[PDB]
Amino acid sequence: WRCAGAATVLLVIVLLAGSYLAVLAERGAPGAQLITYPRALFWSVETATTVGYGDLYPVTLWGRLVAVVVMVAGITSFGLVTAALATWFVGQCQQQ
Amino acid sequence: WRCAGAATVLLVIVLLAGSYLAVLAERGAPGAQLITYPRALFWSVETATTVGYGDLYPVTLWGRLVAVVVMVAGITSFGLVTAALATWFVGQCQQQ
Amino acid sequence: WRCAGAATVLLVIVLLAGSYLAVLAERGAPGAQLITYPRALFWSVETATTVGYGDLYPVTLWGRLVAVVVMVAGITSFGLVTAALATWFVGQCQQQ
Amino acid sequence: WRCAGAATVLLVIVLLAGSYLAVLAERGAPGAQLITYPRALFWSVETATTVGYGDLYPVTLWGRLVAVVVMVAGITSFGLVTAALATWFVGQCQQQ
Numbered sequence: 001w002r003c004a005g006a007a008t009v010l011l012v013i014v015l016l017a018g019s020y021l022a023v024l025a026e027r028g029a030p031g032a033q034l035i036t037y038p039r040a041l042f043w044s045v046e047t048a049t050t051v052g053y054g055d056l057y058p059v060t061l062w063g064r065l066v067a068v069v070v071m072v073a074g075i076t077s078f079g080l081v082t083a084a085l086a087t088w089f090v091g092q093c094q095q096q
Numbered sequence: 097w098r099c100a101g102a103a104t105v106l107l108v109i110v111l112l113a114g115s116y117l118a119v120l121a122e123r124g125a126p127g128a129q130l131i132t133y134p135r136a137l138f139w140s141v142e143t144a145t146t147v148g149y150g151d152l153y154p155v156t157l158w159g160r161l162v163a164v165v166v167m168v169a170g171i172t173s174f175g176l177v178t179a180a181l182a183t184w185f186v187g188q189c190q191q192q
Numbered sequence: 193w194r195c196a197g198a199a200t201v202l203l204v205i206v207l208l209a210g211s212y213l214a215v216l217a218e219r220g221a222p223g224a225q226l227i228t229y230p231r232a233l234f235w236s237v238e239t240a241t242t243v244g245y246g247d248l249y250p251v252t253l254w255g256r257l258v259a260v261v262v263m264v265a266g267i268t269s270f271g272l273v274t275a276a277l278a279t280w281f282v283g284q285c286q287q288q
Numbered sequence: 289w290r291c292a293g294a295a296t297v298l299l300v301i302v303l304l305a306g307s308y309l310a311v312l313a314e315r316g317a318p319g320a321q322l323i324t325y326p327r328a329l330f331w332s333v334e335t336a337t338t339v340g341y342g343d344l345y346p347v348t349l350w351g352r353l354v355a356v357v358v359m360v361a362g363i364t365s366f367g368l369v370t371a372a373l374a375t376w377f378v379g380q381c382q383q384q
């Protein structure tokens with residue numbers, strides 16, 4: 001019925017697994033700033049929402065490969081979460 | 097009928113409340129640049145539209161949590177505002 | 193019929209008028225880098241497509257107001273241009 | 289049937305051809321950082337997904353023209369790849 005929660009679960013899984021694997025892939029490259037889990041979790045949100053401020057980004061092969069998975073899986077899931085919120089909002093747009 | 101104004105109202109509420117709570121959450125962290133309301137209002141627009149230049153961004157736990165609300169609520173509402181503008185434009189695309 | 197060209201015309205108008213008014217609004221503020229028309233035209237593309245690298249952005253009240261018009265009018269028109277390209281691509285996706 | 293692979297092929301072609309032509313267009317301008325193929329390939333992903341961190345961007349006329357092609361062709365194709373992933377996910381959203 002409300003599979004929007006299932007897409008929300010998949011989004012949180014991508015945000016958590018992405019931030020965990022990013023720190024795992026970035027530690028080892030001199031100059032890398034995506035090397036601590038707390039700020040790496042907000043980087044996953046920056047990538048999945050496509051906002052991308054640029055304060056945090058990968059600079060390694062794997063780290064950028066992890067970002068690709070966060071892009072493909074996160075933007076799709078976040079697009080499904082924000083689409084359900086759009087449908088619900090219209091459902092009251094006529095109950096004026 | 098034209099609930100596009102209702103989504104526009106929700107967008108302005110998210111832009112204003114987001115910029116107000118961001119300054120409230122960022123003041124206190126040394127090095128924070130999102131600490132004045134006027135430029136924080138344009139940061140809300142940068143986030144809601146997903147453009148994200150990167151000249152302004154939060155660096156605190158709460159400030160980033162405020163950004164998440166601006167992302168979830170702002171991108172959904174701005175997506176509804178820009179979708180209604182798209183529909184209206186097509187309505188004249190055949191009145192050539 | 194192919195109103196996609198009409199949305200393409202509106203996009204070019206927003207890109208040109210936006211880059212012209214941005215330079216007009218940014219010149220006068222010390223430190224502004226969006227002050228020449230050639231690179232301001234690519235800034236309009238960065239904003240309308242929502243990519244937003246961050247190498248160029250407004251720092252004035254009007255300049256940021258011009259960016260809002262480029263966001264509202266440009267993302268809507270570019271969304272219509274890229275949607276027609278998507279429909280056309282599917283039209284051959286079954287002429288295998 | 290599953291033309292999603294065809295849009296995926298077009299995306300990879302735009303990512304590869306875009307990163308190849310970007311290095312070809314950027315080498316020659318002092319200060320250009322998009323001058324090696326490996327990191328230019330991730331720049332194509334940053335542009336096509338619209339994330340745009342800002343660590344890499346063109347600064348030449350042609351290089352920015354190449355970016356426009358990566359924007360028009362890449363965002364359209366990546367939008368088709370992520371839309372098929374969204375449809376497939378809903379197909380199991382009711383096989384609970």
Ligand SMILES: CCCCCCCCCCCCCC(=O)O[C@@H](CO)COC(=O)CCCCCCCC
Pocket residue numbers: 059060061062064065068304307308325326327329330333
């Ligand atoms: C014409 C061909 C265009 C593309 C060629 C790409 C070749 C890949 C070879 C990888 C070697 C690593 C180079 C190196 O030692 O540098 C690493 C450390 O700086 C950075 O790694 C990287 O550059 C990351 C690779 C790009 C990410 C891939 C995006 C996936 C869609």
Ligand SMILES: CCCCCCCCCCCCCC(=O)O[C@@H](CO)COC(=O)CCCCCCCC
Pocket residue numbers: 016019020037038039041042045155156157158160161164
């Ligand atoms: C494997 C687990 C991966 C994720 C773990 C996250 C743990 C959160 C603990 C918070 C402690 C704060 C750390 C600190 O003192 O630093 C703050 C000041 O720099 C920055 O705050 C932050 O890092 C903000 C947290 C991330 C934003 C959350 C995004 C919501 C979707």
Ligand SMILES: CCCCCCCCCCCCCC(=O)O[C@@H](CO)COC(=O)CCCCCCCC
Pocket residue numbers: 112115116133134135137138141251252253254256257260
């Ligand atoms: C609680 C209220 C939150 C929002 C309050 C906003 C008040 C606006 C007053 C403008 C005074 C200019 C300040 C200044 O001298 O500085 C300018 C030069 O740095 C920068 O201009 C600016 O900050 C631009 C304003 C923000 C852009 C508006 C985005 C439209 C959606």
Ligand SMILES: CCCCCCCCCCCCCC(=O)O[C@@H](CO)COC(=O)CCCCCCCC
Pocket residue numbers: 208211212229230231233234237347348349350352353356
């Ligand atoms: C009112 C008119 C507004 C727009 C005018 C644009 C005129 C173009 C003339 C090009 C001359 C190059 C200037 C130069 O020597 O500088 C190059 C090296 O820095 C940078 O090239 C550039 O500025 C790139 C041009 C902008 C990209 C085009 C985006 C396409 C949608």
Ligand SMILES: CCCCCCCCCO
Pocket residue numbers: 021024025062065066069
């Ligand atoms: C360099 C350490 C490799 C860690 C990569 C984790 C798995 C990445 C999958 O994209």
Ligand SMILES: CCCCCCCCCO
Pocket residue numbers: 117120121158161162165
């Ligand atoms: C550190 C001050 C906390 C201010 C947070 C305001 C409410 C945030 C809701 O996301």
Ligand SMILES: CCCCCCCCCO
Pocket residue numbers: 213216217254257258261
């Ligand atoms: C400071 C000079 C003002 C120029 C503004 C041009 C019109 C902007 C419309 O948003």
Ligand SMILES: CCCCCCCCCO
Pocket residue numbers: 309312313350353354357
């Ligand atoms: C300055 C070298 C020109 C290279 C341009 C390659 C083709 C670009 C097509 O947009």
Ligand SMILES: [K+]
Pocket residue numbers: none
């Ligand atoms: K920077």
Ligand SMILES: [K+]
Pocket residue numbers: 049050051145146147241242243337338339
């Ligand atoms: K974006």
Ligand SMILES: [K+]
Pocket residue numbers: 050146242338
């Ligand atoms: K988008």
Ligand SMILES: [K+]
Pocket residue numbers: 053054055149150151245246247341342343
């Ligand atoms: K930046």
Ligand SMILES: [K+]
Pocket residue numbers: 050051052053146147148149242243244245338339340341
């Ligand atoms: K962006």
Ligand SMILES: [K+]
Pocket residue numbers: 052053054148149150244245246340341342
């Ligand atoms: K950026």
